[PDB]
Every structure is written in C-alpha cells, then in structure tokens.
C-alpha cells in the first residue's frame, strides 16, 4: 500500500500517554489460554 | 507478505516482478522498540509520522470480483 | 524526623519519590547553573558539570519530559511476536517474554490487593520492590542483580536481549534472513563446465524454477490450467524436463 | 499500582537519572529499591517561622 | 483490635525474614520464593485476627494451593526461542496449516469451474444465491439489498439452487 | 489429538483425494507393510477439524447448495518428505 518515502526515523522517550494511546487495552490477568478449550482467557496476555 | 504472493502471481502469469514492499522485520523491530518504551516514529519528508498498516478491502475486492 | 517535624517536610522511598523529585525538578536552573560552573574553570568538578551538562541539556533541548524515565504503564508486545505453541506430548512452549510479563502482572495485582487490604508498610514496600525488580527483568534481565531464571536455572531472555548480540533481531533478523527460491547441496568438481556455467541437479532446478516451469507448461497444452501444472511439476511428470 | 523506573536510565552507566538529579548511582539504588528514604520536599517558611 | 494488628507487625516481621528460607527450599526459585513469601503475608495478615509454626502452616498451605492451581493451568515450559520444527509440528494439528505464497496466489485465482456455472445462471438468480449461500445474508436482507418482494428472492433462491445443482455434481471440487 | 475445533481423526477417508493414491492404505488409512512409498506419498491419513470461516467462498457455495456435512476437515495426513 505504501512505497517507502521515509525521510527519517525518530526515537524518543515514551510517556504513559504514548503507551496508553498505543494500547488496545489493559492486561489484568496472569492467565494465558484455557487448558480444556485452548481459547485465550479474557484480560490475559493472549486475550 | 504481499510482495511474495504478488511475485508468485507475476511469474505464473508471465508478467514482470512487481516493486518490493516493506519487510516485516522492520515492523517487528519497531514493535520491540515500542515494547522497550522507546517512541519510534517513521517520519515522511514533511515531518508527519506515517502509520504502517494494510488495506483489508483489496483482498475482499479481488475475491468478490472473482465470482462476478 | 516524622514523629516530630513531620509536617515540615515530605519524604518517601521507591520510584514514586524519584518521580516526585522529577516533578519538582527545574531543568533551566540546573542547566545554566551547570553551564556557569563548567565554564568558570577547568578541573575534575568541571568534568562533572560537563558530563552532567550533556544529559541535562539533552533533556532541555530535545523536548523530552524527564518524567519519561519513570513509568506508570508498561507496554505489552503483540502476542504473535511472543507466541505459545503446544508440543508433542501435551506440553506448551512460551517465549520467555510471557513469563516475564506474567511475573510483572502477578506482582502488580498482589500490590493492588495489598493497597486495598491496608497491609503493613513493610509488606507493601516489599511488593513494590518486587514489582520494580520484575519490570527490570522484563526490560533488561540480569542488568541488575541475579537474572530471573526458568527451569534448569536458565536466565530468561528479556526485551533487551531481542535487540542485542549475534542471535538478536538486529544482526540475524534484519541484516540477514531466510529466503525463498534457494537451495543447497554438496559440491563436486565440474571439469567439463565452462567458466560461466554450473551443474544443477535436475530436481533442484525443477523446484527452484517451479513457477516458471508451470507458466511455460500452461503456455503449451501439457497442463490444462495452472493448478494442474502445479500437480504435474510436483509429481515430476515426464513433460517437465524439456520445458525445464 | 506504583511508579517504576526504567532500568535503562538508572543502571546504564553513566546513570541518566543519577546525572539528572545529581544523585550517586548507589544512593539512587538505595532509593529505588527501598533501602533508604529520600526527602521529596521541604517547607522553608514553616520551618523558619 | 487495631493494636492487635500492630502486635502482628512486630511479632510477624522478623519471623517473615526467616520464612524466606523455608520458601526458597520449597520453590527452588528465588523469585518464586519471594512470591510465595508475600502470598503467605497476604493470607496471614487478613486472617491473623483469627489467631512460627502457624505461619509455616499458612505458607505450606499456600504453596500446595499453588500446586493445585498449577495442575489446572496449561503446562508451560519457557523457551529462549520457538524453533521452526515446533512451529511446523504445531501447524500439522492446526485448523489451518502453514500456507505458502504459492498456495495464496493460486487460491486467489478464479475457479474457472464454479465461476462458469455461476455465469450460466441468470443475473438475478446468481445474485440471490450469492447474497444468500455465499455471503450468508438472511432472506429479508436479500429482499432489501436488491429491491424485490420476498417472493422473488425466495423463488429465485430455490430455482437458482436447483439449476446450480444440475450444472455440477461433485463430492469435492 | 484434541484441537480447538475438536478431535482429529486418523482415517482412510480424505477429502479431495483419489482412490488411486489411497490404494496402499489399509482400512484405517495407514500405509501397508511392504508398500513402496515415494516423495509426497501418504503414510498415515489424518483429518483435522476446520472452521466454517476457513472455507473458500466456492466451498461454502457447495456446502450450502448440497447441504453437506456440518463437519469440515483439512487434510493433515502424514506424507513422505521431499527426496525420500
């Protein structure tokens, strides 16, 4: 969809505002997936 | 990911090999840097930050036009 | 000092206190003060003010808020970059990142439970220290203290480990990669070859050039369509050697 | 549930936090890891009066 | 009984420093020993008003409960990197395997079988069966998308279905 | 094994596969003692449960037209590797 017109690549410290804008949600649970159903648990690392 | 499939199409149809896209390795690098709390943006010539994604409609437009 | 005089000041442990020191930090005062002290004379203390001046001035000119050095929210990398796959035998295999993130999560949630439960300040402080150390292990593992280990007493690979070394994502995931339309085999001497030629094993060439052989196979009538051409090249039908 | 310092800016030598606040890296270690208290603010007028 | 909690504090805190030695032997992992110690603290302080060997019983109870929860969760062994062999082996049992650029490109190609049988159908019937069977719209929504009564949508669906059943007979194709 | 969509099956019945290439399989879908196997041949037939969102639009057209079986499977059969 995009050829690379990139002029430069910038790097700086990310504040909590940046991290929260990146985020699609908060991971509140240690669980990964269900052992029986192999389904990702809600609010988990794989949610 | 799009360049490889389009390349196979181009060879199988006897067409020219298309122009390459963006490596997934660079996107992965950016995601890792972000996961390190490094804010890494790709700037265009005008100074704005480009957002890297892919259009979903292209595969749906071709797949839908396939049947008629 | 808190029993008497406690209302004349405020003090704390941990990273919340460092954050409070950065909120009250005046960067311009220290900037031109250090510029003055460094410009006044030459010596060891002038080198202190120069080296401090590089970082303080760095935060002054770049527009970076120094509050970025203290985090209230930790990013979480997408799961495809830290996948979980089941093996033969029912076991599962996760990237070390999942165990690091999981430790940060458990210790953070226990810290919340301790804040709600009104636990002793010693317990809450222990949990805060454990949280800081677990986020440390998440970003750069082993940079401070003993590294967090998995089974077999193996230090887990942190987010910093992905960017570092010959096995990291910089050296072998970027400067080099695995490629399609490639092969390998043992080499034997070619004495009958011309200098511009090389002998290619037939099956190797058929696999390498497979799409070209399919296209040229559909151009002629050997293959009805391209899918049947794929089926013929995969089966090594005798029609493929002339086209190849 | 509580702020955390980024270890890159603390343990990386020379300490970026330590050079920002003019704190010795080992004292900053004592503060961040809860070995020692630090004074965040002081009321000057209330102490003088 | 707030002062009781204070009593807890003193009588608890040195014992806790020794309880680590008990947890480290149990978990064999120092970070898991810290986790187990703090979990023993959370269980003790909330239930200390109820009532050192006692704190050791709470500790061991919490360790064994962590074992029981460990039986219920999926068994995970962490790895520095997942190997390509494990990715392929896992894909062999997966609903969708590891597709290749070839399979993608050829799957994106026209069928030249189904497409011909669809073009033989009149445009109204192929449109109705496209919105119905291929896309999955409910019948009323098909009556809305193209402007027709329900009767023409249903009738064109049945007749187009019949004609397409005639134009091909395949167990797989 | 068991998957998200349910149990796999080792079987001789493999969709989109001719009777000619199943010749050396027994009634279970396992190759027969003494068979000569080549590159790409079937050793053990296996099917894995598939989802209805993974069917191609044409496959879904067939399934809806003929009212086919609710169980959709992919061919996961063990095959002889290349050059063997």
Swiss-Prot record, chain A:
Function: DNA-dependent RNA polymerase catalyzes the transcription of DNA into RNA using the four ribonucleoside triphosphates as substrates.
Oligomeric form and interacting partners: The RNAP catalytic core consists of 2 alpha, 1 beta, 1 beta' and 1 omega subunit. When a sigma factor is associated with the core the holoenzyme is formed, which can initiate transcription.
Reported induction: 6-fold repressed by starvation.
Record-given protein name: DNA-directed RNA polymerase subunit beta'
Similarity section: Belongs to the RNA polymerase beta' chain family.
Gene name per UniProt: rpoC
Disulfide bonds: none
Portion of the full sequence shown: 2 to 48 of 1316
Curated annotation (Swiss-Prot), chain D:
Induction profile: 6-fold repressed by starvation.
Quaternary structure (record): The RNAP catalytic core consists of 2 alpha, 1 beta, 1 beta' and 1 omega subunit. When a sigma factor is associated with the core the holoenzyme is formed, which can initiate transcription.
Family listed: Belongs to the RNA polymerase beta' chain family.
General function of this protein: DNA-dependent RNA polymerase catalyzes the transcription of DNA into RNA using the four ribonucleoside triphosphates as substrates.
UniProt name for this protein: DNA-directed RNA polymerase subunit beta'
Residues of the full protein shown: 98 to 146 of 1316
From Swiss-Prot, chain E:
tRNA processing in keyword set: no
Motif (Polymerase core binding): 35-38
Gene: sigH
UniProt keyword terms in alphabetical order: DNA-binding, Phosphoprotein, Sigma factor, Stress response, Transcription, Transcription regulation
The protein's role, per its UniProt record: Sigma factors are initiation factors that promote the attachment of RNA polymerase to specific initiation sites and are then released. Extracytoplasmic function (ECF) sigma factors are held in an inactive form by a cognate anti-sigma factor (RshA) until released. This sigma factor is involved in heat shock and oxidative stress responses; it positively regulates the expression of itself, sigE, sigB and a number of transcriptional regulators as well as other effectors of heat and oxidative stress, leading to direct and indirect control of up to 25% of the bacterial genome.
Source lineage: Bacteria, Bacillati, Actinomycetota, Actinomycetes, Mycobacteriales
Result for mutant: residue 79 to A: No in vitro phosphorylation by PknB
Molecular-function GO terms, alphabetical: DNA binding; sigma factor activity
Example GO biological process: cellular response to heat
Post-translational modification comment from the UniProt entry: Phosphorylated, possibly on 2 residues, probably by PknB. Phosphorylation of SigH has no effect on interaction with RshA.
Region (Sigma-70 factor domain-4) residue spans: 113-164
Family to which the UniProt record says this protein belongs: Belongs to the sigma-70 factor family. ECF subfamily.
Protein name per Swiss-Prot or TrEMBL: ECF RNA polymerase sigma factor SigH
From Swiss-Prot, chain F:
Origin: domain of life: Bacteria
Transmembrane residue ranges: none
Annotated function: DNA-dependent RNA polymerase catalyzes the transcription of DNA into RNA using the four ribonucleoside triphosphates as substrates.
Family: Belongs to the RNA polymerase beta chain family.
Oligomer and partners: The RNAP catalytic core consists of 2 alpha, 1 beta, 1 beta' and 1 omega subunit. When a sigma factor is associated with the core the holoenzyme is formed, which can initiate transcription. Interacts with CarD, TRCF (Mfd) and RbpA.
Protein name per UniProt: DNA-directed RNA polymerase subunit beta
Gene assigned in the entry: rpoB
């Amino acid at each position: 969809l995009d050829v690379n017109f990139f002029d430069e690549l910038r790097i700086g410290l990310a504040t909590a505002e940046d991290i929260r804008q990146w985020s699609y949600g908060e991971v509140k649970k240690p669980e990964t997936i269900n052992y029986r159903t192999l389904k990702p648990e809600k609010d988990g690392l794989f949610c | 990911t799009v360049g490889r499939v389009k390349v196979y199409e181009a060879i199988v149809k006897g067409e020219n090999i298309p122009e390459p896209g963006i490596p997934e390795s660079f996107k992965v690098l950016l995601k890792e840097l972000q996961s390190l709390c490094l804010n890494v943006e790709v700037l265009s010539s005008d100074g704005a930050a480009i957002e890297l994604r892919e259009g979903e409609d292209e595969d749906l437009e071709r797949a839908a036009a396939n049947l008629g | 000092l808190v029993d008497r005089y406690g209302e004349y000041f405020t003090g704390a442990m941990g990273a919340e206190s460092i954050q409070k020191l950065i909120e009250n930090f005046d960067i311009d005062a220290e900037a031109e003060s250090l510029r003055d002290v460094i410009r006044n004379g030459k010596g060891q203390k002038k080198l202190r003010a120069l080296k401090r001046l590089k970082v303080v001035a760095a935060f002054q000119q770049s527009g970076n808020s120094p509050m970025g050095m203290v985090l209230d929210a930790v990013p979480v990398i997408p799961p495809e970059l830290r996948p979980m796959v089941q093996l033969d035998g029912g076991r599962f295999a996760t990237s070390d990142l999942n165990d690091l993130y999981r430790r940060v999560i458990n210790r953070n949630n226990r810290l919340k439970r301790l804040i709600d439960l009104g636990a002793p300040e010693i317990i809450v402080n222990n949990e805060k220290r454990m949280l800081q150390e677990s986020v440390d292990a998440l970003f750069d593992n082993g940079r401070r203290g003993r590294p967090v280990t998995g089974p077999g007493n193996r230090p887990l690979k942190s987010l910093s480990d992905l960017l570092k070394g010959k096995q990291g994502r910089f050296r072998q995931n970027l400067l080099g990669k695995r490629v399609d339309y490639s092969g390998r085999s043992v080499i034997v001497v070619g004495p009958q070859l011309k200098l511009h030629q090389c002998g290619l094993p037939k099956l190797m060439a058929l696999e390498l050039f497979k799409p070209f052989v399919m296209k040229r196979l559909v151009d002629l009538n050997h293959a009805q369509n391209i899918k049947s051409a794929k089926r013929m090249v995969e089966r090594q039908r005798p029609q493929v050697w002339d086209v190849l | 549930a509580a702020p955390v310092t980024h270890i890159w800016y603390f343990k990386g030598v020379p300490s970026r936090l330590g050079y920002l606040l003019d704190l010795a890296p080992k004292d900053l270690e004592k503060i961040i890891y809860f070995a020692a208290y630090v004074i965040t603010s002081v009321d000057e007028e209330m102490r003088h009066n | 009984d707030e002062e009781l909690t204070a009593r807890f504090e003193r009588d608890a805190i040195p014992l806790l420093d020794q309880l680590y030695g008990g947890a480290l032997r149990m978990t064999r992992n120092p970070a898991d020993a810290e986790d187990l110690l703090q979990e023993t603290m959370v269980k003790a302080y909330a239930g200390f008003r109820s009532f050192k060997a006692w704190l050791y019983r709470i500790l061991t109870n919490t360790y064994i409960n962590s074992y029981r929860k460990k039986q219920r969760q999926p068994a995970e062994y962490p790895t520095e990197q997942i190997t390509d062999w494990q990715l392929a082996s896992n894909a062999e049992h997966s609903s969708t395997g590891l597709r290749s650029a070839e399979v993608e490109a050829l799957e994106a190609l026209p069928d030249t079988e189904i497409k011909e049988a669809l073009q033989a159908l009149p445009e109204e019937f192929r449109m109705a069966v496209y919105y119905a069977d291929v896309e999955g719209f409910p019948y009323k929504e098909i009556a809305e998308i193209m402007d027709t009564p329900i009767g023409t949508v249903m009738s064109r669906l049945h007749r187009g279905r019949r004609q397409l059943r005639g134009l091909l007979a395949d167990v797989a194709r | 094994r068991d998957t998200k969509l349910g149990a796999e099956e080792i079987t001789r019945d493999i969709p989109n596969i001719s009777d000619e290439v199943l010749a050396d399989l027994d009634e279970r879908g396992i190759v027969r003692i003494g068979a000569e196997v080549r590159d790409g041949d079937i050793l053990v037939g296996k099917v894995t449960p598939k989802g209805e969102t993974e069917l191609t639009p044409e496959e879904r057209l067939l399934r809806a037209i003929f009212g086919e079986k609710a169980r959709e499977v992919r061919d996961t059969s063990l095959k002889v590797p290349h050059g063997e």
